[PDB]
Design a protein around this ligand. Structure first.
Ligand code: A1BBF
Ligand code: A1BBF
Lengths: 124, 122
């Protein structure tokens, strides 16, 4: 299983420690392809994105990059899991919340402390 | 001339005034189109029926980025407006998706937005 991980960087790194947690778990389930010059980045991740079997994304921290990766990932027909925290106070965008279909694209609300648990349940 | 605008909403509304300015100008030049699943499907419709997607991308937003991802995949023509005065560095997914031709990113100053839009639209 080849896994692509999306999570905010230039939109804010508020959740970096959580991203690391989320990635540490994914490496128990597969290789993680992720992690003028912005053109290299764009070009490289678009290739990794093409190769993934699951696209896992943390969508609390608003970010253009994460949004665009999801848009290209829907186009490529990839299987997509999004993770959102209602505790944050924000309201997930409707473009994300309503691209969900309940299987190929899923969106799960969670509390930050049980992310490993949830991850175990999805990749089983 | 069918026009789709995107700007931040559930990821921030600091630029609401500036969005109104862009929409007003957009209307000179053409038709402007602007449950959560209704919204996603209805918007994905206009996005498809569009001939050019204009996004203001100064403020980070999942939905503007998504819409942009889908428009690159609908090979639609795209123009992005970015404000260095915000102090943000724009996402590399946006600056680097650009090809100078069918996908453009222009850095402008808040005052000149009307002028930029006039140049873009002959
Ligand atoms: O928050 P961002 O920055 O807008 O997008 C964040 C997403 C886009 N990423 C690709 C990327 C990787 N290294 C630097 C950049 C510069 O942005 C972008 C991975 C991340 O999931
Ligand atoms: O900031 P957002 O919400 O993440 O995305 C912002 C873009 C998504 N919009 C579609 C939309 C329309 N009515 C409510 C919502 C609630 O999101 C969203 C147009 C806007 O260009």
């Amino acid at each position: 299983p080849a896994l692509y991980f999306c999570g905010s960087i230039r939109g804010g790194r508020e959740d970096r420690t959580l991203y690391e947690r989320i990635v540490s778990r994914l490496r128990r389930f597969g290789t993680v392809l992720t992690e003028g010059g912005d053109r290299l980045i764009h070009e490289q991740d678009l290739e990794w994105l093409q190769q993934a079997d699951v696209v896992v994304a943390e969508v609390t921290q608003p970010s253009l990059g994460v949004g665009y990766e999801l848009g290209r990932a829907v186009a490529f027909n990839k299987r997509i899991l999004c993770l959102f925290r209602p505790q944050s106070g924000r309201v997930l965008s409707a473009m994300i919340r309503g691209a969900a279909d309940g299987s190929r694209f899923q969106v799960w609300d969670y509390e930050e402390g049980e992310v490993e648990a949830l991850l175990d349940r999805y990749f089983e």
